[PDB]
Amino acid sequence: ATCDDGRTTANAACCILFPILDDIQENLFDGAQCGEEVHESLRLTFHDAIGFSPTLGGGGADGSIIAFDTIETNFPANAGIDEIVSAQKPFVAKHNISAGDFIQFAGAVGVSNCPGGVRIPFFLGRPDAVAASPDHLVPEPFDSVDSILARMGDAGFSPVEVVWLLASHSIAAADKVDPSIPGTPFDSTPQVFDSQFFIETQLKGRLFPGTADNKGEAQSPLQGEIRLQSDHLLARDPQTACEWQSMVNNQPKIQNRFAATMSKMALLGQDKTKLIDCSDVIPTPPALVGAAHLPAGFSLSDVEQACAATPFPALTADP
């Protein structure tokens, strides 16, 4: 189909997304950057979608976190999410699409700005949310591995799928875990979608980048980086360690599994067959910049290897 300004897409219904793409690229993502608002919007896709439980209710990727913001943004696990919800809301009103669709669309456009990144499949037509998520459906960084895996499993994800989704922490930072050092990233390359997150979480912790007493925070190996205790555990627990290590220096795997699993998460509470495939509207991401490495001055001996079956790969360090 050929849209009005000449751009093309497989299904004509998708044409409406083009003005939205252009608006959010300039006015949410600061000129198509892989920056703060991209990272926040990607977090939002998760805090919206994971509000889904067959037992407990919540309609998944339904835009409930915007429609029912008054309730949802006050859940403790949602601390800091009000900022991005506030920024996205006017865009939803202005453009003529549901909040559920807008959240997933902004997340997929955002990720496509990141070098090494992917186009997450995107489907258009979610109806408006009809209920707020219950509380206690979002995992917290002080939760156990068993807790996190049981919650994610309740929403439909296997343990390996949890690891794959947490490639998102390759382009991510924390503002609320330690409020003394807001905007401290989880890896040394928060503007590149790469395997550094899986490498650097495996390193022995050395220091706290800010204060020492934050709930859900573990020691970091680098002053410029913060480490969640959930990530410290998932990297090391026998249930997940081998999958975690398998992501290291495996960019095609990170790419493939993150796109596929983000699609599944974007469709929680939804039926793909009542939606329209608009995947080809998402921009082509740039190729990876840089190659997997240990931080300068580190060696293999700084890695806390946790996969019994398979030795950690021989990376070189920045010089």
Ligand code: HEM
């Ligand atoms: C599986 C259990 C998870 C836990 C315990 C967890 C925990 C956290 C925490 C504590 C923060 C920092 C919030 C702040 O203090 O500002 C955060 C940030 C973030 N999370 Fe995770 N998360 C999980 C999974 C996910 C998943 C599945 C996604 C996929 C979209 C996601 C995407 C992000 C992103 C992109 C940020 C960066 C936000 C920013 O830079 O503003 N997280 N996460």
Ligand SMILES: [Ca+2]
């Ligand atoms: Ca929701």
Ligand SMILES: [Ca+2]
């Ligand atoms: Ca990164």
Ligand SMILES: [Fe+3]
């Ligand atoms: Fe509407």
Ligand SMILES: [Fe+3]
């Ligand atoms: Fe913030």
Ligand SMILES: [Fe+3]
């Ligand atoms: Fe480096």
Ligand SMILES: [Mn+2]
């Ligand atoms: Mn942030």
Ligand code: NA
């Ligand atoms: Na531009």
Ligand code: NA
């Ligand atoms: Na509506």
Ligand code: NA
């Ligand atoms: Na909880």
Ligand code: NA
């Ligand atoms: Na804990």
Ligand code: NA
């Ligand atoms: Na366990």
Ligand SMILES: [Zn+2]
């Ligand atoms: Zn900005």
Ligand SMILES: [Zn+2]
């Ligand atoms: Zn912000």
Ligand SMILES: [Zn+2]
């Ligand atoms: Zn365990």
